[PDB]
Design a protein around this ligand. Structure first.
Ligand SMILES: NC(=O)c1ccc[n+]([C@@H]2O[C@H](COP(=O)([O-])OP(=O)(O)OC[C@H]3O[C@@H](n4cnc5c(N)ncnc54)[C@H](OP(=O)(O)O)[C@@H]3O)[C@@H](O)[C@H]2O)c1
Ligand SMILES: Nc1nc(=O)c2nc(CNc3ccc(C(=O)N[C@@H](CCC(=O)O)C(=O)O)cc3)cnc2[nH]1
Ligand SMILES: [Mn+2]
Length: 159
């Protein structure tokens, strides 16, 4: 099945100038935990902000342009990206904006982190139809010494 994983601040903001303004060590631990040993699909911009292959996962990048690093897999369309994953139980789509928009309809599960932070950005998470989704897991956390804002980890399943 296909799942989307993402961190959103106020207003569904997900990035600004090809980067994520905040720093939340706990959220990144959660991201790694949920994606390790699974294939991750990302768009070219995202590949670029990340700057290197994510270890322990098959990294698949979507680009209309030919590949430029053999350490990852390059695909030119959504169907090929999905076929490149092979037979696995869960495929993780990691963004960015344009790529989330294209996979949303095909996704059965969303792993969202809501962050209490007001950031002015240029990329947003798609505006999905709440009706259609069921929250099956929620876990709130106040801010602390290592994490600058409070956040909520949530998992939705398409009804
Ligand atoms: N907070 C989060 O959880 C989170 C997660 C991911 C990203 N982000 C952020 O989001 C921004 C990057 O998002 P973005 O929307 O600018 O770009 P993106 O979605 O990472 O990348 C867009 C690109 O990927 C390729 N692509 C997408 N769909 C394709 C398709 N169907 N066939 C072929 N190529 C396709 C195209 O590359 P070519 O131009 O080479 O065709 C397109 O320009 C950043 O600020 C990043 O920091 C945030
Ligand atoms: N919940 C969530 N938070 C994010 O920050 C996020 N970021 C992306 C894309 N950007 C990035 C940027 C850096 C790393 C990264 O450095 N990850 C390391 C974690 C380090 C640790 O495990 O403590 C990794 O191995 O996953 C991942 C995605 C996609 N979905 C997200 N989803
Ligand atoms: Mn159902």
């Amino acid at each position: 099945m296909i799942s989307l994983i993402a961190a959103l601040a106020v207003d569904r903001v997900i990035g600004m100038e090809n980067a994520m303004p905040w720093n939340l060590p706990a959220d990144l631990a959660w991201f790694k935990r949920n994606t390790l040993d699974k294939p991750v699909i990302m768009g070219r911009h995202t590949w670029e902000s990340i700057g290197r292959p994510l270890p322990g996962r098959k990294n698949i990048i979507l680009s209309s342009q030919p590949g430029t690093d053999d350490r990852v897999t390059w695909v030119k369309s959504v169907d090929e990206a999905i076929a490149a994953c092979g037979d696995v139980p869960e495929i993780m789509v990691i963004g960015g904006g344009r790529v989330y928009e294209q996979f949303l309809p095909k996704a059965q599960k969303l792993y969202l982190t809501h962050i209490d932070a007001e950031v002015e950005g240029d990329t947003h998470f798609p505006d999905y139809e709440p009706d259609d989704w069921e929250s099956v897991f929620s876990e709130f956390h106040d801010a602390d010494a290592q994490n600058s804002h409070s956040y909520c980890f949530e998992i939705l399943e398409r009804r």
